[PDB]
Design a protein around this nucleic acid. Structure first.
Lengths: 50, 136, 79, 113, 178, 116
RNA sequence: UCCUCCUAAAGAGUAACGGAGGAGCACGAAGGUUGGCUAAUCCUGGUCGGACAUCAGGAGGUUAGUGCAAUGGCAUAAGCC
RNA sequence: CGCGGGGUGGAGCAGCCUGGUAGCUCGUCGGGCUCAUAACCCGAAGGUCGUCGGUUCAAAUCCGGCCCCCGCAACCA
RNA sequence: GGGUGAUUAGCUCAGCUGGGAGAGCACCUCCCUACAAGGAGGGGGUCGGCGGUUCGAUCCCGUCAUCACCCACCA
RNA sequence: CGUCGUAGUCCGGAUUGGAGUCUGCAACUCGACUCCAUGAAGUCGGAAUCGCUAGUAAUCGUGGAUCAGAAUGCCACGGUG
């Protein structure tokens, strides 16, 4: 019960999210990652846990 | 005393005892005792055989032995309905086959080396032979 | 737990003998996690994540039988 | 400014870095300040402009450290090089003055934790 | 550099037949001056050590940094990646500039100047050559009355014997064994 | 010694060139001399070479180890490899880091007969 | 239930409620890549200096190392900067 | 996707719903008193309220979050 | 023979994200008068040993000692 | 009269040190004196607790016996009050 499961959203705008886990017990800093999607065809950073 | 350093793998299995041995000519003295048969020896049995030779020569000779135990034996106090696991270790053993030299001496006459190696024959599973240096 | 549970040994060793292949791929000994002695030739590379032996060729295997240490390389030659 | 000490007056009187320099005690540093024309009025810690030079000429007139005691490289033999009980007690954490050890023993040469 | 080429021009090269050497490539050279500072086990305030490292960076052309121990399991019952010193080591142009104020003069502050041992062994001709204590250089914000300080001076050489290092050391202001 | 450190920077590149095949350009240097040689896909034969040890290359230089000397070997090996129809190859650098004199050789080859 | 080494026979499969021990999760990093770097441990002198860590020298081990255990690979590093 | 409350000097618990003003009761310590210790008595010491923002002239006090800690309940593979 | 656990200051015992160990008694010096009760001032242990694992072991791992318990086997 | 405005201080004296001066059968050990060098602790004190009468208490001065030399012990005498 020691990790969070978060919803990251594209810097290009997406109703969908990228699904991943994060720290909640010893790191207050954020998780941000570049990913592709065929609606914007650009490969873009997904950010902020919605 | 007469056991190798402990390991996490101490429940060793029995093999299959077979012929041929490479070490057959004396290397510590001029007189020795050779197996000329096959079997197994305990860590108390080799010391009881050494003690019989020690008491036959006392100060007149130093004794050598080529044997130190390489496996334990797994043992339990009574028969059981079968069964669980594998029993614990209780004593240590060395393996012998016919060409092997077992014991050596040098500081004594041959007629006393014969007597000291005769005085151990009733403590051993095989009917041993006397060996000399024999050089031309 | 803890408990001695032993597990199962799972396949490995050989798949066939002599100069094999002639359809699509040269499948060698099915030995997993192996990167010590059995390899493909640089001229005809293959193998996956698990280092299970194969070489990328539609023809027939040949062995080079020589190399560094104990390397013998599954190779190709035209017939 | 540095003329004889290694310290600086911050709020204490002008006798700091002029006293205890291993050559000038509390009575003599007072006399040096008067000989340099410095007064005790309003407890000065920072001197007047160029006034350090008039003070420097007086403290460089006294002997310090390796010039205060200038034969200790030769006086050592009668203490450490030959048999010397006056030294042997010092190198065992003991005094050599006829000390009343039943009163003064303290911590610095053996606890008392 | 003021003085530097002398240490390969004629130093020991004028005496190399006392060693029966024929080529000037058989003769010793200096490689570096290592330096090592007494850290005094300090950890809880640690700013007086950072200021003593600023006074070490005042005598070395290097950036002040930290050294690690090689062991992560030891009889000292050590922790992982353990910070054990600083070095701040001198080679080339920074070593020849360091020779202008260090390893050359110590008498501007004295009490006896005859004491202390001046020995070393290495078998290859590397040395420990410090004469102890400091005279302190004229700078700014240096009136802190800072206590328990030490700096040990070692040399690394191209020499092949214990006496070749002792012959090369004669090119510096070192007092030698009685 | 630098040779024993240079092979530690070359054995992986060479084992990976053994997967690629074709000719190797074998670009090599020492502080006094620069070298290149086109060796066959089996290592049994050399096709053509160039170096700052050649009589005419060595005299038309101010130093046989300079960037201009590495460029002179680049222009020579590219001319001599173009004479043998060589194209579409990779750059083998014999355990050396590519910056400086090794890049000055590669740029001199660019308009002379060899591009990577 | 799954998994590393072994019983298991110069293919597999496999005994028994057999020998030694792991996984049910963690690090967006130990992922991708360019280039660089080289690892147990021991002895001696010099010191802050409380055996030995350190500073340097001498000897010797790819038995060091890897998010986790095992086993093998591995400095060509897939090991760490 | 669902649940009520607390965190106030060293504890315990008020104060918060009155925005501007720190309290009760123990403990801790200095004196006073005696044939021991103590108890009692008269004083003292410790306080922008777990903590980061927002609303406002103004926040312990009004609202949103994060952590420590304890009840309750509908849908929940 | 086989097995589960306990052993921490002179005493009784807490003490596992293992990391350089602690209170209450007791005792010394004392207060009160010559003591007891107890107020004030003060010290600390191969954590029963051995030998390992570990960055670190009182604690984990294998054993010996001291102490208590479980068992001579279902009909 | 001059001065600090409360600072571990112009406070404070133990210790680590120097060089002279005197006595004596002899002063390293187990003395005095002088002029100088280093200058810690101490910020009015556990549980608590001592004393008191009128030239007295308080406080600051003076002398002397024990001696060759040598007390903060011993015994005594004024001012101010």
């Amino acid at each position: 019960g020691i990790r969070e499961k978060i919803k990251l959203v594209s810097s290009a705008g997406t109703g969908h999210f990228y699904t991943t886990t994060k720290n909640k017990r010893t790191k207050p800093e954020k998780l941000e990652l570049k990913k592709f999607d065929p609606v914007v065809r650009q490969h873009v950073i997904y950010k902020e846990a919605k | 005393m007469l056991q190798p350093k402990r390991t996490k793998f101490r429940k060793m299995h029995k093999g299959r005892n077979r012929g041929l041995a490479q070490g057959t000519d004396v290397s510590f003295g001029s007189f020795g005792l050779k197996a000329v048969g096959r079997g197994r020896l305990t860590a108390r049995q080799i010391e009881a055989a050494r003690r019989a030779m020690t008491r036959a020569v006392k100060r007149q000779g130093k004794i050598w032995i080529r044997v130190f135990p390489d496996k334990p034996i797994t043992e339990k106090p009574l028969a059981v309905r079968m069964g669980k696991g594998k029993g614990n270790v209780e004593y240590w053993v060395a393996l012998i086959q016919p060409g092997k030299v077992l014991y050596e001496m040098d500081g004594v006459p041959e007629e006393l080396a014969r007597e000291a190696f005769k005085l151990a024959a009733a403590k051993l599973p095989i009917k041993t032979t006397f060996v000399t240096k024999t050089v031309m | 737990g803890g408990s001695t549970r032993n597990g199962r040994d799972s396949e490995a060793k050989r798949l066939g003998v002599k100069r094999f292949g002639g359809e699509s791929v040269l499948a060698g000994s099915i030995i997993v996690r192996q990167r010590g002695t059995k390899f493909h030739a640089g001229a005809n590379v293959g193998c996956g994540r698990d280092h299970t032996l194969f070489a990328k060729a539609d023809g027939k295997v040949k062995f080079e039988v020589k190399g560094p240490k104990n390397r013998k390389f599954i190779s190709i030659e035209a017939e | 400014a540095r003329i004889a000490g290694i310290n600086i007056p911050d709020h204490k009187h002008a006798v700091i870095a002029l006293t205890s320099i291993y050559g000038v005690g509390k009575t003599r540093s007072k006399a040096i300040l008067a000989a340099a024309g410095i007064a005790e009025d309003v407890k000065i810690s920072e001197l007047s402009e160029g006034q350090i030079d008039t003070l420097r000429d007086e403290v460089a007139k006294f002997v310090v450290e390796g010039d205060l005691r200038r034969e200790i490289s030769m006086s050592i033999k009668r203490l450490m090089d030959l048999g010397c009980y006056r030294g042997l007690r010092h190198r065992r954490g003991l005094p050599v003055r006829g000390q009343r050890t039943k009163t003064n023993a303290r911590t610095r040469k053996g606890p008392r934790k | 550099a003021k003085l530097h080429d002398y240490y390969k021009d004629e130093v020991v090269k004028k005496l190399m037949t006392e060693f029966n050497y024929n080529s000037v490539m058989q003769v010793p050279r200096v490689e570096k001056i290592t330096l090592n500072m007494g850290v005094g086990e300090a950890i809880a305030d640690k700013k007086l050590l950072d200021n003593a490292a600023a006074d070490l960076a005042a005598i070395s052309g290097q950036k002040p940094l930290i050294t690690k121990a090689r062991k992560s399991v030891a009889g000292f019952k050590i922790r992982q990646g353990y910070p054990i010193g600083c070095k701040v080591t001198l080679r080339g142009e920074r070593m020849w500039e360091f020779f202008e104020r260090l390893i050359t003069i110590a008498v501007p502050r004295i009490r006896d100047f005859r004491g202390l041992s001046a020995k070393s062994f290495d078998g290859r001709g590397n040395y420990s050559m410090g004469v102890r204590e400091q005279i302190i250089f004229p700078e700014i914000d240096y009136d802190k009355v800072d206590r328990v300080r030490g700096l040990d001076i070692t040399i690394t050489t191209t020499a092949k014997s214990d006496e070749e290092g002792r012959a090369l050391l004669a090119a510096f202001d070192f007092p030698f064994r009685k | 010694d630098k040779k024993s450190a240079r092979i530690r920077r070359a054995t992986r590149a060479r084992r990976k060139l053994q997967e690629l095949g074709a000719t190797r350009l074998v670009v090599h240097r020492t502080p006094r001399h620069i070298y290149a040689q086109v060796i066959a896909p089996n290592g049994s034969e050399v096709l053509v070479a160039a170096s700052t040890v050649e009589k005419a290359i060595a005299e038309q230089l101010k130093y046989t180890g300079n960037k201009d000397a590495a460029a002179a070997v680049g222009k020579a090996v590219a001319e001599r490899a173009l004479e043998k129809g060589i194209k579409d190859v990779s750059f083998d650098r014999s355990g050396f880091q590519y910056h400086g004199r090794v890049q000055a050789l590669a740029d001199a080859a660019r308009e002379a007969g060899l591009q990577f």
